[PDB]
Amino acid sequence: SVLRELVTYLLFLIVLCILTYGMMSSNVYYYTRMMSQLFLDTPVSKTEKTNFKTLSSMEDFWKFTEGSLLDGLYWKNRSFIFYENLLLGVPRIRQLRVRNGSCSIPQDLRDEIKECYDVYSVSSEDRAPFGPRNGTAWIYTSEKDLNGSSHWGIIATYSGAGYYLDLSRTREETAAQVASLKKNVWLDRGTRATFIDFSVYNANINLFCVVRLLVEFPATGGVIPSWQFQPLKLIRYVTTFDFFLAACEIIFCFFIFYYVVEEILEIRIHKLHYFRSFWNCLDVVIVVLSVVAIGINIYRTSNVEVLLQFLEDQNTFPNFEHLAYWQIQFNNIAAVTVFFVWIKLFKFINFNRTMSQLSTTMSRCAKDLFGFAIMFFIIFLAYAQLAYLVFGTQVDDFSTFQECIFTQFRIILGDINFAEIEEANRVLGPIYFTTFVFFMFFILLNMFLAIINDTYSEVKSDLAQQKAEME
Amino acid sequence: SVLRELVTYLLFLIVLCILTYGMMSSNVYYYTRMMSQLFLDTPVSKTEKTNFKTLSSMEDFWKFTEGSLLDGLYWENLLLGVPRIRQLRVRNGSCSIPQDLRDEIKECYDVYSVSSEDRAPFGPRNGTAWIYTSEKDLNGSSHWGIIATYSGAGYYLDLSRTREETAAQVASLKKNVWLDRGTRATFIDFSVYNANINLFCVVRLLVEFPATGGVIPSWQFQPLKLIRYVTTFDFFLAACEIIFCFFIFYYVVEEILEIRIHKLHYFRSFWNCLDVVIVVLSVVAIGINIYRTSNVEVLLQFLEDQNTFPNFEHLAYWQIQFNNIAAVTVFFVWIKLFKFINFNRTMSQLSTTMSRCAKDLFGFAIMFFIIFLAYAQLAYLVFGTQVDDFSTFQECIFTQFRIILGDINFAEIEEANRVLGPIYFTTFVFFMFFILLNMFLAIINDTYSEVKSDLAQQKAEME
Amino acid sequence: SVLRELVTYLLFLIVLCILTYGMMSSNVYYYTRMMSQLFLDTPVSKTEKTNFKTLSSMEDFWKFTEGSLLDGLNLLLGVPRIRQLRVRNGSCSIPQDLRDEIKECYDVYSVSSEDRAPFGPRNGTAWIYTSEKDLNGSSHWGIIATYSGAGYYLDLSRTREETAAQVASLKKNVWLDRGTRATFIDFSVYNANINLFCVVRLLVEFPATGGVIPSWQFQPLKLIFFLAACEIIFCFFIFYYVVEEILEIRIHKLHYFRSFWNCLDVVIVVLSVVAIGINIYRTSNVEVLLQFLEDQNTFPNFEHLAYWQIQFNNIAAVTVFFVWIKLFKFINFNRTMSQLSTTMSRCAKDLFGFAIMFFIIFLAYAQLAYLVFGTQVDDFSTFQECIFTQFRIILGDINFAEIEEANRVLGPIYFTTFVFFMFFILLNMFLAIINDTYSEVKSDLAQQ
């Protein structure tokens, strides 16, 4: 009975471990590491030191895109990166821009300040063509006429439209085009973000990387760079081992079809709304996250009707940005699902006498232990209020409220020198730090111990009234 | 009785501490450190910065093997004969490419397998370099790299003994193309003997070229005593090896004297199982020290001929295994001191605590690892393409223990993934440090508080 | 009396806590680096970039030290010193089955394994050895060997003119011969910006089959209203203590004390007697210094006076630690202060018993790591330094990317089964001892 259900479970765990390990191999990491060495670690020129990761001005962006992009794409026909990759078609540079009359300045200092610009919103975007209005670069297109989509940066979320220039395939014919975008002014104070996109396919491995290199210019203009390198298998039935991964996907689809029959067989005929004993709620989460991952693997990653349009024409830009976004979502859903498979091993483990004592302890405690985890976070989210308002202008580690929480857990592990904390504020800085280490490590940690210490000492004495009363 | 067994034990611990400390001396480390300074820290040229540890291209490997190998093998040591360079290669028609993009891609190569190795001679087929030999015709053996495990065969060139006659040979392997896109690994081997110390290092310098070709370098420097009889002390270490052989012969008599006449299959009380592990690991270390490290019938073939290549690679592999077995054995000698320690009243209370707990404590160590090996599933699938510290699953486990000690800045973790990155990190520090660590305390806290109250029902029952 | 005739414990103790940090001004810390900024951070020229913390070869060591010492020749005193160790030629053995490799062999810089070795230009005491009766010496034991205090101090003048002239001899009659084993110097600055007494010992070692791995040595010693007014009261409230606590032997359990929380006073009273006895030959040294400012042509001999001074200012801080716990032994006035002293004193019988079982596991991992990692990793170089790097694991502090590279299999078997046993078993047992002890003191007083 129950040993029949373990065989239907342990067969489901081996088909899942084959499929997830078969997707992300060990041959993946050394490819997306060496691509990150060429574009992010090589300096912009032979005499300077700044990387792409350390761009600090608009003029540094120009000495990058003629300095190390042109040495990084092109290896003198076609362009084999590291003599074994291949540059697919053309890259292109896009640009987002803000209108001139986009802020209201007060009437008192109207004299010195002439014209202003705004932070990137969709309502404050520039659309009128400017400058040398010859080509497709100096004229705005919409986000539908270009086959693009949104992307979520560090400051804001940028739309898919803008001012795109589609550069060429050789070293001598892009360095003319990029230098014609420097002689004519293509980046001024009204720009918010530019980013570069291309795709590279190996012949030695059936796998293709899709690069994206954001550089976003804030108001009070500095430079915030960002990147994204992702390999993608898109030719799928080649060897014998990927025949077997195709034969292991349908077996996974049979087990999820096997579980959804058992789901409405257990809610309908009995125990309707009595399905709330935490091993029936975990069975819902694994089966909801699995059918979402089935739908992504069908509709959004098996849509290779973009690549077949590019494999005919070797001279255009391949749009793999809508295809590589669903590879993030497929690897986030199919890794939370693997995490919620190893947790349901706890339902079965439960063999010894000394294994039931450790499950009775953690299950009779979690009523009391959840009650203190609310009182823990209200103190914990009140120090995050204080540090964000006091240190949030001086210290990198307290920059946003989402990142003021993450740096509190670093205190618990160590990991903070606070020589920036006592320098940012002289008095209230160490009043924060000492009364945080005092309350977390003398009070709020020792109370979590005292709950599960008296609970385990009450389970074990209860079973001594179960052995010495039934002796 | 029992104080007779301690004298037979403490005499076994002093003969073992002499033998293990006598093998690895303090004069060893400064020799295999300065050899690692010459080849791994000197830059490849006077104008550049890249070491052997920071080789990043195929062209950087050529500016190494003419730049700092040739300044590093001739000037405190002595170069034994000749070094040589070997090479593993992959056939041309070794992958199937799909029919749709057949036009642009002409010819491919494969990751290193034995079924996809190149054997046909290529290029200037004059010498012994441009012609494949088998792994038996060359007197070689396998080696376990970082990507794959490479065979002993390949394309070897046996370079000469002087600076002016190898730099001609290596530059004749650059003018003719000796390293192309179809190569997977090359590595260099030689051996160096001191006259001032009776000890010889054997060097090996892997450079392996993956598919999607970068460069992954690797090295191995190991000293080896291979001449034994000089003075009174390395006579005394020879007199301390046979005394160790007497005690292991003394224990195997007692092993079948305790299983046969009584308690057959009642030999499972953990001080009889530890006595099996020490005596199995000792006779393995006896067999390595006899058959695999005392076989100096290779060095006597080279001491006649001072012009050939000395094969010390099969001899220096069993020095790793002898130092791994004879150091786990020393670790399992100091643990059996716990069987004897057991003197005071307050020493029996601390042994009764840890022995009555380990039934309950092993039960939670299974529930700890299933949560622990489920975060290793999550981090390997999410962070395994962006972060160095989560590269393989074997190394995703090791970097979880680093979190427990501190040791991780995670500014790469929140950069690799923006949302699920810190959902991983906060719910790992929450469950490990508030729940899963405090439960390990609560087990051995209530166990020690139940031993001590049990003896207060024993020290009152006496009076 | 618990407050009247025992007022000598707590009232005089605030004098020692104040006059320690009150007399110790910044000259032993701030000026100790404000003299160390020139003879350690200045290379020869723009041609040589590796300074004296990166020197390997023989004449490349002569390119390391020769520039900054000429600027050293504040305003120092004494004279220069350029010495070494002299090793024999045929002091060790080699095999005659491959004897066309060896020519001679010898041992490291030791007591009897060395020699005198005069060679060639015997016109001075540079290339001609001597004994230690001329100069001052002792056996010094770094991380190479326990040396000898002998040799030959090949001095130069106080000016850098003759320090340049003897450096012309340093090519032929060099500091590096075929048995070159060490290289040392000696200096002492009589600084005007801090009127204080200095020392120096700048050594670049020499092991065989290679070059050097250097080491620095110096320490500051300031020369001296409340300037020297912390001298009488630091002995006077101890002066009746040598009269009372040695008169306590006539009374205390009939000379038969056997306690812990009061014997830490009389043990540190003997550690007070490490200070009270010393100033009769060593701290009353005028004749070590009265020769120094008198004659300018002589060299400095106060560098050997600094050697007994390192255990003068470090052994004097041992009276800081036990005097505070013996204050808190008398300082637990509250009811809630006696509960915390009864806890730690009734525990230490059981807690010392587990601290022996902790170290046997702890000194068995130090056996394993020294034998396995001791040839590849800097952090496991000696057994004394294999212990110190285990405590670093407990704090974090180790990346172990060198550990899994030194050994592929047994490397992480060491690391995981060390973090497992220390942090899940051996640390939580130290908690469980002092948790059940404190919970048994407090329930005992609820029965009181």
Per CB-CB distance under 8 Å, the chain A contacts of B58 are 83
Check CB contact under 8 Å for B324 and C399: no
B304 interfacial to chain C (CB closer than 8 Å): no
Residue that the structure tokens 């009391």 belong to: A368
Residue C122: how many CB atoms within 10 A of its CB? 11
A309 interfacial to chain B (CB closer than 8 Å): no
Per CB-CB distance under 8 Å, the chain B contacts of A413 are 403, 406, 429
Of A308, A346, A457, nearest to B446 by CB-CB distance is A457
Which residues have a Cβ under 8 Å from the Cβ of A94 and sit 6 or more positions away? A148, A162, A163, A164, A194, A195, A197
Chain B residues 125-164 with a CB less than 8 Å from chain C? 144
Of A26, A412, A415, nearest to B433 by CB-CB distance is A412
Q: How many CA atoms lie within 13 A of A7 on its CB side?
A: 4
Could you give the CA distance from residue B168 to residue B259 in angstroms, rounded to a whole number? 69
CA B382 to chain centre: 29
Which of B30, B299, B321, B403 is best to mutate for the C interface (most C CBs within 10 A)?
B30
* B25, B39, B345 from B449: Cα distances, Å: 46, 59, 16
Nearest to B236 by CA among B9, B12, B23, B8: B23
Task: Report yes or no: C79 and C299 within 8 Å, Cβ to Cβ.
Answer: yes
Nearest to C79 by CA among C301, C287, C291: C301
The technique by which this structure was obtained is cryo-EM
Residue B113: how many CB atoms within 10 A of its CB? 11
Per CB-CB distance under 8 Å, the chain A contacts of B210 are 27, 30
Closest residue in C to B344 (Cα–Cα): C353
DSSP code of residue A311:
T
Q: How many CA atoms lie within 13 A of A87 on its CB side?
A: 28
Continuous H helices in C211-260? 233-239, 241-244
Sign of the four-CA dihedral A362, A366, A372, A375: positive
3-state secondary structure chain B: CHHHHHHHHHHHHHHHHHHHHHHCCCCCHHHHHHHHHHHHCCCCCCCCCCCCCCCCCHHHHHHHHCCCHHHHCCCCCCECCCCEEEEEEECCCCCCCCHHHCCCCCCCCCCCCHHHECCCCCCCCCCCCCCCECCCCCCCCCEECCCCEECCCECCEECCCCHHHHHHHHHHHHHCCCCCCCEEEEEEEEEEECCCCCCEEEEEEEEECCCCCCCEEEEEEEEECCCCCCCCHHHHHHHHHHHHHHHHHHHHHHHHHHHCCCCCCCCCCCCCCHHHHHHHHHHHHHHHHHHHCCCCCCHHHHCCCCCCCCCCHHHHHHHHHHHHHHHHHHHHHHHHHHHCCCCCHHHHHHHHHHHHHHHHHHHHHHHHHHHHHHHHHHHHHHCCCCCHHHCCHHHHHHHHHHHHHCCCCCCCHHHHCCCHHHHHHHHHHHHHHHHHHHHHHHHHHHHHHHHHHHHCCCCCCCC
Residue that the structure tokens 């160096």 belong to: B192
CA distance A243 to chain B (A): 14
Of B380, B391, B434, nearest to A448 by CB-CB distance is B434
Chain C residues 205-264 with a CB less than 8 Å from chain B? 207-211, 213
In terms of Cβ atoms closer than 10 Å to its own Cβ (0-12, 13-18, 19+), residue A263 is: middle
The C-alpha angle B163, B167, B168, rounded to 5 degrees, equals 120
User: Per the annotation, where are the binding residues of A for cholesterol?
Assistant: 329
User: Per the annotation, where are the binding residues of A?
Assistant: 329, 413
B105 interfacial to chain A (CB closer than 8 Å): yes
Per CB-CB distance under 8 Å, the chain B contacts of C407 are 324
C374 interfacial to chain B (CB closer than 8 Å): yes
CA distance C204 to chain B (A): 15
What is Dmax (Cα atoms) for chain C? 90
3-state secondary structure at position C301? coil
Check CB contact under 8 Å for A357 and B363: yes
B1 interfacial to chain A (CB closer than 8 Å): no
Check CB contact under 8 Å for B212 and A343: no
Of B231, B437, B448, nearest to C432 by CB-CB distance is B448
Closest residue in C to B358 (Cα–Cα): C425
Copy the structure tokens of residue C130.
């001597």
CA C292 to chain centre: 26
CA A122 to chain centre: 24
- CA gyration radius, chain C: 28
Could you give the CA distance from residue A260 to residue A12 in angstroms, rounded to a whole number? 14
According to the annotation, is B378 in a ligand binding site?
Answer: no
Closest residue in C to B79 (Cα–Cα): C101
Could you give the CA distance from residue C216 to residue C162 in angstroms, rounded to a whole number? 25
According to the annotation, is B16 in a ligand binding site?
Answer: no
C354 interfacial to chain B (CB closer than 8 Å): yes
Check CB contact under 8 Å for B324 and C409: yes
DSSP bridge partners of B150? B143
Ramachandran region, residue B222 (left: φ > 0; alpha: ψ -120 to 50; beta: rest) = beta
Task: Report yes or no: A57 and A63 within 8 Å, Cβ to Cβ.
Answer: no
In terms of Cβ atoms closer than 10 Å to its own Cβ (0-12, 13-18, 19+), residue B463 is: exposed
CA distance B127 to chain A (A): 28
B438 interfacial to chain A (CB closer than 8 Å): yes
B308 interfacial to chain A (CB closer than 8 Å): no
B76 interfacial to chain C (CB closer than 8 Å): yes
Check CB contact under 8 Å for A28 and B97: no
Nearest to B330 by CA among B266, B380, B287, B277: B277
* A315, B121, C214 from A308: Cα distances, Å: 14, 40, 66
Of B34, B193, B231, nearest to C93 by CB-CB distance is B231
Residue C236: how many CB atoms within 10 A of its CB? 11
Amino acid at C209: T
Closest residue in B to C436 (Cα–Cα): B449
Q: Which helix (H) or strand (E) holds C366?
A: helix C335-372
* Phi, psi of B288, deg, nearest 5: -70, -40
Of A85, A414, A457, nearest to B406 by CB-CB distance is A414
Residue that the structure tokens 């376990």 belong to: B144
Ramachandran region, residue A96 (left: φ > 0; alpha: ψ -120 to 50; beta: rest) = beta
Could you give the CA distance from residue B73 to residue A326 in angstroms, rounded to a whole number? 54
Of B195, B437, B449, nearest to C101 by CB-CB distance is B195
Task: Report yes or no: C217 and C202 within 8 Å, Cβ to Cβ.
Answer: yes
Residue that the structure tokens 């006895």 belong to: C277
In terms of Cβ atoms closer than 10 Å to its own Cβ (0-12, 13-18, 19+), residue B360 is: buried
Task: Report yes or no: B408 and B421 within 8 Å, Cβ to Cβ.
Answer: no
Could you give the CA distance from residue A277 to residue A294 in angstroms, rounded to a whole number? 27
Residue B378: how many CB atoms within 10 A of its CB? 22
DSSP code of residue C334:
S
DSSP code of residue C168:
S
Closest residue in B to C352 (Cα–Cα): B346
Of B96, B370, B414, nearest to A342 by CB-CB distance is B370
Check CB contact under 8 Å for B104 and A85: no
Copy the structure tokens of residue B192.
């160096």
C371 interfacial to chain B (CB closer than 8 Å): yes
Check CB contact under 8 Å for A453 and B435: no
Which residues have a Cβ under 8 Å from the Cβ of B28 and sit 6 or more positions away? B199, B223, C374, C375
- Beta-carbon contacts below 8 Å between A and B: 163
Nearest to B417 by CA among B380, B382, B375: B382
Residue that the structure tokens 């212990």 belong to: C387
Chain A residues 43-72 with a CB less than 8 Å from chain B? none
Per CB-CB distance under 8 Å, the chain B contacts of C431 are 441, 445
Q: Which helix (H) or strand (E) holds A292?
A: helix A282-295
In terms of Cβ atoms closer than 10 Å to its own Cβ (0-12, 13-18, 19+), residue A145 is: exposed
Per CB-CB distance under 8 Å, the chain A contacts of B392 are 26
A441 interfacial to chain B (CB closer than 8 Å): no
Nearest to A137 by CA among A117, A167, A159: A167
DSSP bridge partners of A194? A95, A215
Per CB-CB distance under 8 Å, the chain C contacts of B323 are 371-372
Check CB contact under 8 Å for B381 and A335: yes
Closest residue in B to C434 (Cα–Cα): B445
b/e map C141-155, b = 16+ CB within 10 Å: eeebbebbebbbbbb
DSSP bridge partners of B88? B185
Of B373, B420, B441, nearest to A332 by CB-CB distance is B420
Residue A190: how many CB atoms within 10 A of its CB? 18
Q: How many CA atoms lie within 13 A of C92 on its CB side?
A: 19
Per CB-CB distance under 8 Å, the chain B contacts of A40 are none
Copy the structure tokens of residue A126.
């520039």
Check CB contact under 8 Å for B385 and A449: no
In terms of Cβ atoms closer than 10 Å to its own Cβ (0-12, 13-18, 19+), residue A16 is: buried
DSSP bridge partners of A211? A198, A229
